[PDB]
Amino acid sequence: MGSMGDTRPRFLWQLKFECHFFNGTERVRLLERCIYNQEESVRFDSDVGEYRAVTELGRPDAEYWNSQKDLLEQRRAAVDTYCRHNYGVGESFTVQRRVEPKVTVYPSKTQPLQHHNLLVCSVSGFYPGSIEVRWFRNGQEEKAGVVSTGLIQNGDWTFQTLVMLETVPRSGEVYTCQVEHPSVTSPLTVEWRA
Amino acid sequence: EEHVIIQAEFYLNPDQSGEFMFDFDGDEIFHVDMAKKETVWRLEEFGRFASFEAQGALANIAVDKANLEIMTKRSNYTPITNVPPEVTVLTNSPVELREPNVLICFIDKFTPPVVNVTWLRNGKPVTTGVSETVFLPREDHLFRKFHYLPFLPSTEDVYDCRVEHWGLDEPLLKHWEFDA
Amino acid sequence: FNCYFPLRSYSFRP
């Protein structure tokens, strides 16, 4: 058993400095988290202003660092010197990043029912993640028979999602996959004619 | 919230493996390559817009190693509990025959940050043009990772992403083939 | 330069 060799015990330490931003940079919270294996042990929360043990294993560290007044002063000012600074560094290509989805409609290769057409709307390559993907039959929004995969992160600063609709095609109908997204001022639409 | 920037670091023993990366809303801005001692931007344009002094990351990593060893002794060498990954294979766009595409191996919810990923084409390892991300942090302090294989879709080829991890008794084998 | 700043990590009590 075991899918990999070298099964010696492992020991992991993680440090996470989280800058949380509300309403641009009007409200900023710094959360410094120290994690041993899978358990946070001590943290500095800028809303608190000093280190606090999260587990007992972290109590000695909170006590020692809280005795170091230069460190505390630097960490308390980090919401400005660190969080707001780094926010301004990348604001134009992160906060303001907008990438338009590509929208494709096709029948599923799975067609389980005669006189039905299972349609797939693929929405790929977009940023940020907030999106609406909606099916229409003529001018009528379809709410029944819709399944979505939800957001999928691709790892390259784009997302994709898949939304399917079971249809009973009738002559004269047009089915539209319509996408609302911050990258476009008018919705993207792609049509499948019955 | 609207947005979060995370400076995420780790050190792992006995591997002597470190990582330093910046994260914006769950995507990687950059990491520092520990071997080349250089900043690696996740998207090429990022390196035209911004800079980061790699030596700052290396200095923190040395402290992380020291703190790891203190915590290892303080816990009486309590080791990490392996958590095996969840794996999904998908394409970055709808597949058309003979139109270049990319296979994505999506590896999620695992720790420690050590994994082995092999792309197989028709059961044979393939490496041409493959690429991968470093370990991305999760709020539950597990990790996520992406591996990529550019490919030319065809009706004859099949693919598998094979993922191995200390938490897996057997390798995970996730299949993809043309949806004919 | 347009520079990301890191926060420095500090050791436990020496």
Residue numbers in the entry:
A (entry chain B): -3 to 190
B (entry chain A): 3 to 182
C (entry chain C): 1 to 14
From the paper:
CD4+ T cells recognize a broad range of peptide epitopes of severe acute respiratory syndrome coronavirus 2 (SARS-CoV-2), which contribute to immune memory and limit COVID-19 disease. Analyzing six epitopes, some with very low binding affinity, we solve X-ray crystallographic structures of each bound to HLA-DR1. In summary, each peptide bound HLA-DR1 canonically in the “forward” orientation that is described for HLA-DR,48 excluding CLIP. We observed little deviation in the overall structure of HLA-DR1 irrespective of bound peptide, particularly within the peptide binding groove, where the solved diversity of bound peptides had little impact on the position of the HLA-DR1 residues that lined each pocket.
We have recently shown that CD4+ T cell clones reactive to S486–505Wuhan HU-1 presented by HLA-DR1 were not able to cross-recognize S486–505Omicron (BA.1) at a clonal level, even at high concentrations of peptide (10 μM). To attempt to gain insight into the mechanism surrounding complete loss of T cell activation, we assessed the ability of HLA-DR1 to bind S486–505 and S761–775 in Omicron (BA.1) form. Both S486–505Omicron (BA.1) and S761–775Omicron (BA.1) variant sequences demonstrated an improved ability to bind HLA-DR1: S486–505Wuhan HU-1 IC50 = 1,950.2 nM vs. S486–505Omicron (BA.1) IC50 = 753.6 nM and S761–775Wuhan HU-1 IC50 > 10 μM vs. S761–775Omicron (BA.1) IC50 = 6,777.2 nM. S486–505Omicron (BA.1) possesses mutations located within both the epitope core and the PFR as determined by the HLA-DR1-S486–505Wuhan HU-1 structure. The structure of HLA-DR1-S486–505Omicron (BA.1) was solved at 1.6 Å and compared with the similar-resolution Wuhan HU-1 structure. HLA-DR1 bound S486–505Omicron (BA.1) using the same register. All core-positioned mutations were in potential upward-facing TCR contact positions, i.e., non-anchor residues: Q493R (P5) and G496S (P8). The overall peptide conformation remained highly similar to that of S486–505Wuhan HU-1, with the most drastic alteration induced by the Q493R mutation, which placed the differing elongated positive charge of P5-Arg in the center of the peptide core. The more subtle G496S resulting in P8-Ser did not alter backbone dihedrals, but placed an additional polar hydroxyl at this position. Nevertheless, we have shown that mutations in S486–505 enable escape of epitope-specific CD4+ T cell immunity through alterations in TCR-facing residues that are sufficient to ablate T cell recognition in HLA-DR1+ donors.
